[PDB]
Amino acid sequence: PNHPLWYTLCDRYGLYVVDEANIETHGMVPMNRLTDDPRWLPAMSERVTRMVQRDRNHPSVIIWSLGNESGHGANHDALYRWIKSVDPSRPVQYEGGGADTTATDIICPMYARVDEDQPFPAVPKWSIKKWLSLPGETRPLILCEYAHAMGNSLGGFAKYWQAFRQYPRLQGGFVWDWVDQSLIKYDENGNPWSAYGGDFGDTPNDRQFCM
């Protein structure tokens, strides 16, 4: 959840918002170790429920998200249902555990490609065009993350947009991401420079991946 003023500004300037619970357990092995554990349901529930209680009157919020990169656990299904019960006015999405689980109203993959399949075990990233028409599939597809804008990037961006326009159920996506997470440091002369992972003695670190 963002600073409260953000939603007011999106209400007034006009931007659609996906409001996302503060739940990410990416470093767990497997990713759902905590989110499938009923002992972590209370802690998870508060992060979802208290977000909905705070932000549910904002018109800019059109979609609720259960968090990010926490695999798919039974706690997700429980909280998906809780939101649907308490607020039927907004779709609920969640990418974890393969982007098309029982915990999402929208097929919402991250970095699924336009034409090329990436058939990873358990959590494949299908071609978005192919994903739509998998047997029994009916949901819209909106990428929660696509077109990773790291350094000299956005090659093939036009390919996404051609597909979005041609396919009714391909309804766009969210670019990753808006702003480089660089920090200012100062050299011997007091001149500022842009710093990334490792520049503060932080170790282990992931270097320029924050930008």
Cite the annotated binding site for substrate by residue number: 69, 145-148
Find tokens 């999106």 and name the residue. Answer: 10
148 binds Na ion (CB under 5 A): no
Which of helix, strand or coil describes residue 157? helix
170 binds Na ion (CB under 5 A): yes
163 binds Na ion (CB under 5 A): no
117 binds a second copy (CB under 8 A): yes
| One of 57, 85, 89, 166 touching a second copy (CB under 8 A) | 166
Nearest to 142 by CA among 110, 102, 187, 186: 110
Q: How far apart are CA 79 and CA 44, in angstroms?
A: 8
Site for a second copy in 168-207 (CB under 8 A): 168-169
Q: Is 69 a residue of the active site?
A: yes
Nearest to 73 by CA among 35, 23, 30, 44: 35
Burial of 110-132, coded b for 16+ CB within 10 Å and e otherwise, reads bebbbeeeeeeeebebbebbebb
Specify the residue, 200 or 209, whose C-beta has the smaller distance to Na ion: 209
209 binds Na ion (CB under 5 A): yes
129 binds a second copy (CB under 8 A): yes
Per CB under 8 A, residues contacting a second copy are 117, 127, 129-130, 132-136, 138, 166-169
Residues assigned a catalytic role = 69, 145
